[PDB]
Design an enzyme around this catalytic site. Structure first.
Site, PDB file in Angstrom:
ATOM      1  N   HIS A 459       1.215  -1.009  -0.071  1.00  0.00           N
ATOM      2  CA  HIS A 459       0.118   0.293  -0.130  1.00  0.00           C
ATOM      3  C   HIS A 459       0.787   0.701   0.005  1.00  0.00           C
ATOM      4  O   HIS A 459       0.704   2.116  -0.809  1.00  0.00           O
ATOM      5  CB  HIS A 459      -1.153  -0.421   1.213  1.00  0.00           C
ATOM      6  N   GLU A 460       1.724   0.822   0.848  1.00  0.00           N
ATOM      7  CA  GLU A 460       2.113   2.547   1.013  1.00  0.00           C
ATOM      8  C   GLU A 460       3.993   3.054   0.226  1.00  0.00           C
ATOM      9  O   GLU A 460       4.133   3.845  -0.019  1.00  0.00           O
ATOM     10  CB  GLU A 460       3.273   2.398   2.408  1.00  0.00           C
ATOM     11  N   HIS A 464       0.419   4.484  -3.123  1.00  0.00           N
ATOM     12  CA  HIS A 464       0.618   5.556  -3.569  1.00  0.00           C
ATOM     13  C   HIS A 464       2.056   5.809  -4.777  1.00  0.00           C
ATOM     14  O   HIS A 464       1.802   7.122  -4.915  1.00  0.00           O
ATOM     15  CB  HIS A 464       0.987   5.769  -2.261  1.00  0.00           C
ATOM     16  N   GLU A 516      -6.664   6.658  -1.150  1.00  0.00           N
ATOM     17  CA  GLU A 516      -6.333   5.476  -0.048  1.00  0.00           C
ATOM     18  C   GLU A 516      -7.011   4.063  -0.587  1.00  0.00           C
ATOM     19  O   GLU A 516      -6.478   3.265  -0.383  1.00  0.00           O
ATOM     20  CB  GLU A 516      -7.132   6.390   1.376  1.00  0.00           C
TER      21      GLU A 516
HETATM   22 ZN   LIG Z   1      -2.464   5.542   2.244  1.00  0.00          ZN
END
Ligand SMILES: [Zn+2]
Ligand SMILES: [Mg+2]
Ligand SMILES: [Mg+2]
Length: 710
Positions: A459-460, A464, A516
């Site tokens: 995710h990070e 992103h 997100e």
């Molecule tokens: Zn995030």
């Protein structure tokens, strides 16, 4: 709302002894040890900042336990119940280092009868008419404590522990009928603090974070400075004795030596940790902290922070002092806190491996290179394991320093606290996780944590980190303007980001949850990738499929739990991450090629349900609805298609009548505020740092603090 302590509050032992701590070198363990000791030495400081009765209550709790030899009433089953209730209050008190909860700033009281509480005194043979002052360690300087405000222990219980008044049960200006432990003496007003902020602190360039205010008169104030020194040894910055402000009326005097006992202990432990610092910057940083707690110089703390920001990705990350300033009414004085967090060194290595292979996974993502950066720029992301956090409440992350000048000129640190975030998702309590079928409890309980970490990292980093916005610059575009990239329909997009336009400006408030979600879906997408799993240490097909299954199951559950943060009256979401997770769970349920991929089995009384997710469909329906959702989100974002993008995501995050019907059920299964228990370290006969853990029980929490006194 009630003012009672929580019942059946979940307790989490912040364990790092088995997996994380052993990875640290000897030097790192010693450093972590003494920084931890320094942290805990400030426990009483926090208490004195929560409410005037807080420390006295702490002392009373210790006294009772000591004089009862840890043996509480257990004759009649009623005594057992009353004991449990008493210990639950003690536990929550310890979790908040005071009797006003950090989450809400409201006073809470025991559920056990007051009569029973006073019976504890009888059994412990504690004279209720004696002064609370008699319960304090003899070397605590009572000139700077609040014990004296309670003539007798009986009064401490009645007023301090049990008494409730709507206004008094809230932190705020005492002049307005509220409570604040930052202020002593006569009731401090907003006007008072406004004057002191400008005409004293600002006027003399003195940072106020480490002070408390004692109003000795209508126009006379004492500024108590937290320091070991009982005298002003920094007269170059701090005025000596009483001074008069510009109005020629207000009198102010700086008094040093507040929390002197604890400041001395904190400083002594910092000095020990200094011997084991990882580099010169950490050593210098510690020296400034030491100067700060010894002399009371607030500037010294700022100097520590400037050095701290320059300490890149340490193995043992720390921060200590009067940091956050929101609990004090005027909002300029800081509450003590201290953090000791350690790297998961194995996880750091795995993350590095993910970075080294980033380009490969980026290419695998379900979109054209037209919507991707030519070269991967790895985002900055830090995840650490909390070993110690002394304070009113343990955050899921930290973003400090709070000095705007240091943040702007030198920078700031943004760190995620892994074992804290993990707890919020784990939903650990005195029995099964909500909405997970008995059939799934084994695999879920075993792989939930692992899947969570895998998803967070992806995710990070890749989430992103991926994507390129079709953008216009003052002299050209970063894409073929003549023949723009193709949309989801196979036709050239007509949208893009004009000069000055950004993701945030174009998509407004929706940008948050939207992005997100995109990052979350990217994680779900890559979760099933073979090399990804290898990198994260899942090499056999059996364990891989379990991690995958747990990942999808956990996401489904998260999307349902999210309903709590959706307002059925306004239809507005309260948290971006919740809206995103819900949209993903809704995607599984209503947008898969197979209606039976995700189902909810209601019980006969329609007040509970079990998640039925078909593991055997993850490869097909599961992956395809995730890949589908991801393609739309990404292309919409990158092509700047705010019109289609907004409707698409808003719809997917819309709570349908059937799901809305489940909200009450979700609310009923909510676990009370989590209480964290912290390990205790010590050096053994072999000069080896050893961690002691405790049961996840009220008695365990109590023991963890008992072992810190002596
Ligand atoms: Zn995030
Ligand atoms: Mg691709
Ligand atoms: Mg189009």
């Amino acid at each position: 709302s009630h003012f009672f302590a929580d019942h059946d509050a979940p307790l989490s032992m912040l364990s790092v002894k088995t997996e994380y701590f052993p990875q640290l070198t000897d030097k790192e363990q010693k450093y972590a040890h003494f920084m931890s000791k320094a942290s805990h030495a400030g426990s009483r400081v926090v208490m004195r900042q929560v409410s005037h009765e807080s420390e006295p209550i702490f002392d009373l709790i210790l006294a009772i336990h000591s004089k009862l030899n840890g043996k509480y009433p257990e004759d009649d089953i009623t005594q057992k119940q009353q004991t449990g209730l008493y210990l639950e209050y003690v536990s929550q008190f310890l979790s908040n280092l005071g009797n006003f909860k950090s989450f809400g700033d409201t006073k809470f009281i025991p559920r056990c009868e007051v009569k029973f509480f006073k019976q504890l005194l009888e059994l412990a043979k504690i004279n209720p008419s004696s002064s609370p002052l008699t319960l304090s360690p003899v070397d605590v300087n009572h000139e700077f404590t609040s014990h004296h405000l309670f003539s007798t222990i009986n009064e401490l219980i009645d007023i301090g522990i049990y008494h409730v008044e709507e206004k008094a049960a809230l932190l705020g200006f005492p002049s307005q009928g509220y409570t604040s432990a930052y202020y002593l003496g006569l009731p401090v007003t907003p006007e008072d603090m406004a004057l002191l902020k400008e005409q004293l602190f600002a006027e003399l360039a003195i940072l106020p974070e480490n002070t408390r205010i004692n109003k000795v008169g209508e126009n006379s104030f004492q500024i108590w400075v937290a320091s070991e020194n009982v005298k002003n040894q920094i007269t170059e910055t701090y005025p000596s004795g009483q001074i008069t402000l510009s109005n020629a009326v207000t009198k102010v005097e700086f008094i040093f030596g507040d929390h002197s006992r604890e400041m001395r202990l904190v400083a002594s432990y910092l000095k020990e940790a200094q011997k084991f610092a990882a580099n010169d910057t950490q050593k210098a940083m510690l020296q400034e902290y030491i100067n700060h707690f010894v002399t009371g110089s607030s500037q010294a703390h700022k100097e520590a922070q400037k050095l701290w920001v320059k300490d890149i990705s340490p193995v043992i990350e720390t921060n200590i002092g009067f940091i956050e300033t929101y609990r004090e009414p005027s909002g300029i004085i800081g509450e003590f806190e201290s953090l000791v967090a350690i790297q998961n060194k194995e996880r750091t290595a795995k993350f590095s491996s993910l970075v080294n292979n980033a380009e490969e996974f980026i290419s695998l993502l379900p979109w054209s290179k037209d919507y991707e950066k030519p070269i991967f720029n790895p985002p900055d992301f830090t995840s650490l394991e909390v070993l110690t956090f002394t304070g009113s409440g343990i955050p899921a992350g930290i973003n400090i320093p709070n000095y705007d000048d240091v943040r702007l000129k030198i920078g700031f640190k943004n760190v995620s606290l892994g074992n804290i975030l993990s707890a919020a998702a784990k939903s650990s309590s005195k029995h099964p996780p909500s909405f997970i079928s008995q059939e799934d409890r084994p695999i879920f309980e075993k792989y939930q944590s692992d899947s969570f970490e895998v998803q967070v990292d992806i995710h990070e980093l890749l989430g992103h980190g991926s994507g390129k916005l079709l953008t216009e610059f003052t002299d050209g575009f970063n894409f073929d303007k003549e023949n723009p990239p193709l949309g989801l329909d196979g036709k050239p997009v007509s949208t893009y980001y004009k000069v000055g336009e950004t993701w945030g400006s174009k998509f407004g408030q929706l940008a948050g949850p939207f992005e997100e979600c995109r990052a979350e879906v990217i994680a779900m997408f890559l979760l099933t990738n073979k090399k990804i799993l290898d990198i994260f240490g899942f090499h056999d097909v059996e364990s891989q499929d379990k991690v995958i299954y747990a990942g999808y199951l956990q996401m489904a559950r998260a999307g349902l739990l999210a309903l709590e943060y959706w307002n059925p009256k306004t239809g507005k979401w309260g948290q971006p991450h919740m809206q995103a997770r819900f949209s993903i769970m809704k995607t599984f349920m209503k947008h898969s090629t197979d209606k039976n991929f995700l189902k909810l089995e209601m019980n006969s009384t329609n007040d509970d349900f079990a998640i039925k997710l078909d593991k055997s469909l993850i490869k097909t329906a599961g992956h395809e609805c995730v890949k589908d959702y991801l393609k739309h989100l990404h292309v919409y974002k990158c092509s700047g298609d705010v019109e289609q993008g907004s409707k698409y995501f808003i719809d997917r995050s819309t709570v349908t009548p059937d799901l809305a019907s489940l909200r009450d059920i979700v609310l009923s299964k909510r676990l009370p505020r989590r209480q964290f228990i912290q390990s205790n370290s010590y050096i053994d006969d072999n000069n080896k740092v050893t961690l002691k853990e405790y049961d996840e029980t009220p008695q365990g929490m109590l023991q963890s603090f008992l072992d810190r006194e002596l």
